[PDB]
Amino acid sequence: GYYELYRRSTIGNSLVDALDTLISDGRIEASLAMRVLETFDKVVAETLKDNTQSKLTVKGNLDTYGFCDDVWTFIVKNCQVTVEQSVISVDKLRIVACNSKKSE
Amino acid sequence: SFNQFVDYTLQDIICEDSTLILEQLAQHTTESDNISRKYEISFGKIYVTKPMVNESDGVTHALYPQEARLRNLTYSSGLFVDVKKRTYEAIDVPGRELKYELIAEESEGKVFIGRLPIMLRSKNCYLSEATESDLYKLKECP
């Protein structure tokens, strides 16, 4: 099984709009839209796991944390994010993470 | 007679039942547990040290016949044998002979197996290489 969290990203969020827009057109079945969505998690999980080599680090202050159903939630305020180079200042950054060990 | 036994017979005796093998069969209870493990312990060369005594606190030092007689100590030396520990595992398929294979676990050491009393004026005794002057130094009668 693969998590459905990625749906909330920019790529995932726009997919729902793209699929729902055609759903309103009536050219796609509602179930047919769910099956493709399930396959979306698989492809995203594999590509992210093998086709990237960048590094990130976030340093700041945690304003909120939470753990429920093996889904950690963090909120960092006034943090500096560096890529691999250039630091980026942020005001509020929410972090959502699931357990590394996939739940079968 | 003693020189022959220490030099040759000791090795020969150990090289008879040096191998002890315990076989853990498949124990078929589920398909996820179908491997058969074989554990092997083998004895190799044997080493004999010079006469020595270990005190109560654990300090070991060379012992001479003169000291042993007064202190009621046994004039004996330690025996060490190289031990080869090997383990083999194989996949047990029903109704077929197994093909045991080495599982990349072959420990390479000396193990103490006891003390052997040493007959005086033998090849393993301190007085074999002692001259008349040396024997007088060691308080031993030539």
């Binding site: 796991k49 990237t52 202050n61 | -």
Partner: protein, 107 residues
């Protein structure tokens, strides 16, 4: 970010090719596959994410990062989080990473 675009191009390529098999199962025409790629691609560029080839209680424009956590620990005021295989969105800009060390002081 060139890397972010490259991964995004990979995402569209895999899903469109992987979803073809199920479309034939439902008996939908092939032209729908191109329209799905057409509308989806225009959505990504419309959002303008990156250059493309084409209180005590719990309560786009807001930054968000999705990932997986390997190990999380804290020392009495200092959380230390290990992240893996996530996509981040900062100030309307997106990046991707294989790992990320997030440690902050819990005031």
């Amino acid at each position: 970010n060139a890397e972010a675009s490259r991964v995004y191009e990979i995402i569209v390529e895999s899903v469109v090719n992987e979803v073809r098999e199920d479309f034939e199962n439902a008996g939908i025409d092939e032209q729908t596959l191109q329209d799905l790629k057409n509308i989806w691609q225009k959505k990504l560029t419309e959002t303008k994410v990156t250059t493309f080839s084409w209180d005590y209680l719990i309560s786009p424009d807001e930054n968000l990062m999705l990932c997986l956590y390997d190990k999380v620990t804290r020392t009495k005021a200092r959380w230390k989080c290990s992240l893996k295989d996530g996509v981040v969105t900062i100030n309307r800009n997106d990046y991707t990473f294989q790992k990320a060390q997030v440690e902050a002081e819990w005031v």
